[PDB]
Design a protein around this ligand. Structure first.
Ligand SMILES: CC(=O)N1CCN(CCCc2ccccc2)CC1
Ligand SMILES: CC(=O)N1CCN(CCCc2ccccc2)CC1
Length: 460
């Protein structure tokens, strides 16, 4: 039985509004309703992995697992296996996989982060799951961020706290946050960003939604505008939104948006908004294609509608050669030529690099670079031709060209990372000097760039 080179992944996010679900929720897992929907001809085809994020979830883990599994079994006639379940307060993530994947999945991790302090600590935060699927690392984050139209900055701060402090994936990748630890990272939830238009415009917004004219609403969506100004979710992608705002509905219908201020809302307006979102970040030149992104129309127990997204995701095999794992393969090498980092820092320590990759027996530390001043004020750290030759465990190009090198630039004085990035080995040529580039981030914010050339030797 061959190992797959692609899998499909279902992502669901639903703020359940503290109410039990209705008896049938299959439309969610079938990607039916509004937006980019899944073809009817696929309805019986199971996804490989289902990842369900809930917020304001009133159910026990047992109660929700029984609903989810019985739902999938009705759709597919497959009994899914539970990979992981993790709950923080009323924020929950469930990962289910087809039984054939049980032996392909390993290194299962769970974590949570509580956001805010005192007043603002007690119900918002995130849960996450990571695991390996054969040679591919997968991360999943369900976050419930701060509510309210005038708190976009708090939401951005919640995002940074979550990506700093959520402890998933390989702990040996110590300089790297979750935004670098995974081949594919999916981040979803009730992110709570709003359509920023005046309150007086509520009925106009409702009109536009009834006409399915979302353009003048999406141009005021705080998540898209904050992302465009590089305030949040730097280097993540989102599919185009082609479904109506998923919040705030009157329960038991979808015919009415309940936006007016009430004692129960803290006297806040809830203009119709895309609170419920799915974003992703995959390593460079790895296959990832969004095949659905939408909302259900027939699940009405909550003041939010469920959101679905599905993905094709490239995966790689566990690789064994006569040499690695357990030794190097002398027919392989990775050379960095003429490399330099450009950093935004005002500091003047020396810097060194660390190269981390599962194609190496362990991470590699460079010598210190040579600091120069850039023409527009910047620090440039030159490595020239000084960088250590990297010795991969396997030389076979079918393995090596699918790998990635994580880079951290660290202060000699503090050993703290000033910037992290990622280089794909999916090159146009081997034994050929080719340009490389990554932006560098720290705590998910842009701190610099790394560029140079690479020369990759494989056994072919
Ligand atoms: C954190 C958590 O909720 N756990 C319960 C389920 N466990 C996984 C059960 C075995 C398995 C199933 C499917 C793929 C691989 C392995 C792991 C621990
Ligand atoms: C080379 C490439 O294909 N890409 C890199 C740049 N990306 C730009 C996304 C622009 C945008 C729109 C709205 C909010 C934030 C950002 C798109 C993907």
């Amino acid at each position: 039985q061959p190992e797959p080179d692609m899998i499909t992944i279902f992502i669901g996010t639903w703020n359940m509004g503290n109410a039990p679900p209705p008896k049938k929720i299959t439309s969610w897992f079938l990607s039916k309703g509004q937006g980019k929907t899944r073809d009817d001809s696929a309805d019986y085809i199971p996804h490989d992995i289902y990842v369900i994020g809930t917020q304001e979830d009133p159910l026990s883990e047992k109660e929700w697992l029984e609903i989810l599994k019985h739902s999938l079994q009705e759709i597919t006639s497959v009994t899914f296996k539970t990979v992981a379940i993790h709950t923080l307060w009323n924020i929950r993530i469930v990962v289910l996989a087809k039984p054939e994947h049980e032996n392909r999945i390993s290194h299962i991790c769970t974590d949570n982060v509580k956001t805010g302090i005192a007043n603002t600590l007690g119900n918002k935060g995130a849960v996450g799951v990571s695991f390996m699927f054969n040679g591919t690392s997968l991360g999943f984050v369900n976050s419930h961020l701060t509510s309210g139209s005038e708190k976009k900055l708090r939401r951005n701060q919640n995002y940074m706290n979550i990506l700093r402090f959520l402890a998933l994936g390989d702990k040996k990748l110590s300089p790297f946050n979750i935004t670098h630890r995974f081949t594919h990272l999916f981040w979803f939830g009730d992110l709570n960003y709003r359509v920023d238009l005046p309150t007086w415009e509520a009925e106009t917004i409702i009109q536009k939604i009834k006409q399915q004219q979302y353009a003048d609403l999406l141009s005021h969506d705080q998540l898209l505008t904050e992302r465009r100004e590089q305030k949040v979710f730097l280097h993540f992608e989102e599919e185009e939104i082609t479904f109506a705002p998923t919040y705030r509905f009157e329960r038991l219908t979808r015919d009415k948006y309940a936006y007016t201020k009430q004692k129960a809302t803290g006297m806040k307006y809830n203009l119709p908004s895309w609170c419920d979102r799915v974003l992703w970040k995959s390593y460079p030149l790895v296959h990832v294609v969004c095949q659905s992104y939408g909302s259900t129309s027939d699940i009405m127990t909550s003041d939010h509608s469920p959101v679905f997204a599905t993905f094709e995701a490239g995966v790689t095999s566990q690789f064994v050669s006569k040499n690695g794992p357990g030794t190097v393969d002398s027919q392989g090498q990775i050379e960095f030529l003429r490399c330099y980092a450009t950093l935004k820092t005002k500091s003047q320590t020396k810097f060194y690099l660390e190269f981390h990759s599962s194609c190496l027996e362990s991470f590699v530390k460079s010598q210190e670079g040579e600091n120069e001043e850039g023409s527009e004020g910047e620090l440039v750290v030159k490595f020239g031709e000084t960088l250590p030759k990297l010795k991969p465990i396997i030389s076979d190009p079918e393995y090596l060209l699918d790998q990635h090198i994580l880079i951290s630039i660290k202060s000699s004085d503090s050993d703290e990372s000033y910037g992290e990035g990622c280089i794909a080995l999916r090159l146009e040529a081997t034994e050929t000097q080719l340009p490389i580039y990554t932006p560098l981030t720290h705590h998910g914010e842009l701190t610099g760039h790394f560029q140079g050339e690479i020369k990759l030797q494989t056994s072919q």
